[PDB]
Amino acid sequence: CQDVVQDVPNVDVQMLELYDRMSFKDIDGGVWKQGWNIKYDPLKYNAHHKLKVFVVPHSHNDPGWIQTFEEYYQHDTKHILSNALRHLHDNPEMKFIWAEISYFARFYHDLGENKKLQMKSIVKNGQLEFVTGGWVMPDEANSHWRNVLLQLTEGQTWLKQFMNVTPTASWAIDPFGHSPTMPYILQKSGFKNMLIQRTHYSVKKELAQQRQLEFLWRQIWDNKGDTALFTHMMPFYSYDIPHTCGPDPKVCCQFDFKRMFGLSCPWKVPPRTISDQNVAARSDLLVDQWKKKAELYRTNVLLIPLGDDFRFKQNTEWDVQRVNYERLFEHINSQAHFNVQAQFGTLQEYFDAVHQAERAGQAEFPTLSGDFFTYADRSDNYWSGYYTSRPYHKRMDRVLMHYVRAAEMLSAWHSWDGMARIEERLEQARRELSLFQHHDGITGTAKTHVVVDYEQRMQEALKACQMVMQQSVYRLLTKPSIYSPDFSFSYFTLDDSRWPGSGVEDSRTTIILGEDILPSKHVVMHNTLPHWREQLVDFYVSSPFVSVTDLANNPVEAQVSPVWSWHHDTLTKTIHPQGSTTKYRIIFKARVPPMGLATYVLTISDSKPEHTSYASNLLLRKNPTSLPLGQYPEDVKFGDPREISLRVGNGPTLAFSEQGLLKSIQLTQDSPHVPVHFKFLKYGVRSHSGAYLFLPNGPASPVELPVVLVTKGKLESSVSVGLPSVVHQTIMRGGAPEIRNLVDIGSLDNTEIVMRLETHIDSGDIFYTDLNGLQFIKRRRLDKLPLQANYYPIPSGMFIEDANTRLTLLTGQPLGGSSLASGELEIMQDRRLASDDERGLGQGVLDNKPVLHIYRLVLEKVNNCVRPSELHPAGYLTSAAHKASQSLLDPLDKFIFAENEWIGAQGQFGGDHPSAREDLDVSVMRRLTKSSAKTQRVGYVLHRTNLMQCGTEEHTQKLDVCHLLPNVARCERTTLTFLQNLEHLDGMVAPEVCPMETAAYVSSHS
Ligand SMILES: [Zn+2]
């Protein structure tokens, strides 16, 4: 095994370091606007050192942007691949690369057998080539690493099944910034090489100067060097033909043969058909470009992409590009003076050639670690707005992410008869989720009608996850002797207190109890994590007089709180809460096995149970209306606005300011009231910013201000303020608090609502954000760079720390954030924008809906924690912080029994299940086989995080995922897509995964 805290990795290019050293000066550099005039010695090239040129045709296809997936399919993409099929068939030497399997599958199932076999031919012989082979070309900023794997597996499996192919080269031309989570995943999936485009123009500049655009990209912790994937960064502004042939767009544009008159060259200089008349001169023009570009690479091998957005649509586009290019090649290759071999190639061809050139001693390649955020395409145009854009759907991503994992896991335990339609529903759930991983989905960068389409897809996916989950729970918890299922029937419905969230929609069922009508109700909790988890759960009940027992009929400590619903009187411009008189919240701690189920019973009585406590309700306002709660025991107490100090359990004592905003945290009963000021601030737009670009007009200024609701219970206490736009809540359950905001920006125009945390922590210039919920990276705030440059993705978490203290904020939804000062954390909530970015949308953001954002807040003492070196580019969470994240992203699933009596009800599932070390996670459990298959196969993905040793350790059972199901007959260790066996495990025992490593195993059963 390998240590990731003490031993700082020795890299050629550490990106944080480089960031400290660069000028980031926006120097006009010539025709290559963001570079220089490239000079090459022409006597570099002779017969023994010829230039090898791969011209690589592509179309960039958005699975949704201006148009929906199916719109783009009918209008554009079906034609593209219909021609690719016809042309590559007809033209043996013609090549094409393809990335988006979403469209490829959409096309191939329409094909007519003959067509499928021909499509197979041109794949077999290497003419058509899949690159990455993801369901989509994913966003790398906002996407969770699990969903990155998901989309990958969807596409690559499709490819394995239908095409017999597994791509080992990746292609990422349009993501807005690049994440190291990609090489992490791709290298663990048997990939050999990757390619990126959109990095910061100044980084393109700094790297090109040093011949560092090709590099072995390794993880920020990786000392040993095994995570390292070969990366080709492309050097120019775009992936268009203008920016691909070499440094001069004016030149490059004349070899985009589609442009001769709908399309045209914005350098005024048209392309011209190649003939015997012009060949030699055009050839010279072009070879000079190639050779210029080739100067930026350590080898005499060179990659020339040929295409653009939805290219190769027209039949005649295929001739015009091909024929003209054939003419140039045929010339250049016979003209020995040039010293150039030029041909239509694929991305693998390019890559294999680079390595073959490295075999022949031409180059030794540099090591790089770090990330490629925050991307700027030009001047002070940083793309940090998209970290936040359409935040509803960002939340929705996470919810569905959870529902996918749980539905796959819950149904994994049993083989299912085909009539059950479990496969079909899981297939769809994954696809819809995989689709939203697209760099115009989760980013929030599409048109309104497309965002609508994604929602509908995701809604259907959720509906599908519920069905699979309930059917499964019913099977797992009903005696085999009773189990006699109607696959189409609802045994259970989910309850989700967090999605959409109670302000957002009235979507939660009330359990209706009564002495005559329905005396008691079975509820079931699911725990997807492979450890014992205790967690507070709530349900809506029709009476306060409800007691909780387990199925073993033993009483369970409960709290009843009312059902609060914030109203806005337009009458007053006031944010008042309202009580429900007809429904109540029952809260109790559920204990649930590793990867298991636990049943519970809610029973009514005629009065207060022994073991059910009531919460008091204080409503601080100047001038109250007295407020009925019906049968609720305790009447609402009223008062003038005061400073507050609540505790719950032994877990921390939180002080609140007089308008209900956390003002300090006291950890123990010795520790100081350590100050932590929540503030709300607004940003605006310059007059001198849109769906992609964060363009602020100066520092953020506070929101002008105010009703405060305190609920105080034995299990749970909240503090809830209704400010304009935001209903802010602080919930306390005897650990690190929960922050919920119901954000409605709504009317407020050209505005961006942020959440700041002013602490007296001596962070200085240092903060740490995460990347894809996989890793925490160090960020230095840079005085040189503008504000929006200091904003990073917060997909899951961020933290600041001094020598003694840390404050971590975990999220349940990816947002934008920064530590703009010493002891700050901030994080964007929503953004409404009238102005377009002019990146091709046509709109700003004018479609905002209410969203319930969720957080956790972990203040901690870190002085006796085994801390990484000042030099180390990574951070690592503590137990507390890590569990807080798990609590956000993977909560307990709640199931209410639909009918009146549950004959055959069992109490529990998986009490026999091993309870694995807290730092281990079964990220995926998925059955890989249908019932009508001889051998049942079940894949597992295990991820081991790394946490700070802090003394902090109670013994736990080793988990061997090979033996989680009986009759194991084979356990191979696989690629993360499950598509290739890496290891035969003798004795069918899965070894321990190292910290920061991610393994996948497939177990076979008999
Ligand atoms: Zn795109």
UniProtKB/Swiss-Prot annotation:
Catalytic reaction annotation: N(4)-{beta-D-GlcNAc-(1->2)-alpha-D-Man-(1->3)-[alpha-D-Man-(1->3)-[alpha-D-Man-(1->6)]-alpha-D-Man-(1->6)]-beta-D-Man-(1->4)-beta-D-GlcNAc-(1->4)-beta-D-GlcNAc}-L-asparaginyl-[protein] + 2 H2O = 2 alpha-D-mannopyranose + an N(4)-{beta-D-GlcNAc-(1->2)-alpha-D-Man-(1->3)-[alpha-D-Man-(1->6)]-beta-D-Man-(1->4)-beta-D-GlcNAc-(1->4)-beta-D-GlcNAc}-L-asparaginyl-[protein]
Leader peptide range in chain numbering: none
GO-annotated cellular components: endoplasmic reticulum; Golgi membrane; Golgi stack
Cofactor: Zn(2+)
GO biological process: encapsulation of foreign target; mannose metabolic process; N-glycan processing; protein glycosylation; rhodopsin biosynthetic process
Membrane topology: Single-pass type II membrane protein
Keywords (A to Z) from UniProt: Disulfide bond, Glycosidase, Golgi apparatus, Hydrolase, Membrane, Metal-binding, Signal-anchor, Transmembrane, Transmembrane helix, Zinc
Enzyme Commission number: 3.2.1.114
UniProt-listed Gene3D superfamilies: 2.60.40.1360, Glycoside hydrolase 38, N terminal domain (3.20.110.10), Glycoside hydrolase family 38, central domain (1.20.1270.50), Golgi alpha-mannosidase II (2.60.40.1180), Golgi alpha-mannosidase II, domain 4 (2.70.98.30)
Pathway annotation: Protein modification; protein glycosylation
CDD domains for this protein: GH38N_AMII_GMII_SfManIII_like
InterPro entries assigned: AManII_C (IPR041566), Gal_mutarotase_sf_dom (IPR011013), Glyco_hydro/deAcase_b/a-brl (IPR011330), Glyco_hydro_38_C (IPR011682), Glyco_hydro_38_cen (IPR015341), Glyco_hydro_38_cen_sf (IPR037094), Glyco_hydro_38_N (IPR000602), Glyco_hydro_38_N_sf (IPR027291)
Positions annotated as active site in the UniProt record: D174 (nucleophile)
Co-factor binding comment: Binds 1 zinc ion per subunit.
A Pfam cross-reference name: Glyc_hyd_38C_2
Induction of synthesis: Inhibited by swainsonine and by copper sulfate.
Membrane side Lumenal: residue ranges: 1-1006
Protein localization: Golgi apparatus membrane
Binding site for Zn(2+): H60, D62, D174, H439
Group of enzyme by EC: hydrolase
GO molecular function: alpha-mannosidase activity; carbohydrate binding; mannosidase activity; mannosyl-oligosaccharide 1,3-1,6-alpha-mannosidase activity; metal ion binding
Entry's family note: Belongs to the glycosyl hydrolase 38 family.
Subunit structure: Homodimer; disulfide-linked.
Record's function text: Catalyzes the first committed step in the biosynthesis of complex N-glycans. It controls conversion of high mannose to complex N-glycans; the final hydrolytic step in the N-glycan maturation pathway.
The protein's name: Alpha-mannosidase 2
Taxonomic lineage: Eukaryota, Metazoa, Ecdysozoa, Arthropoda, Hexapoda
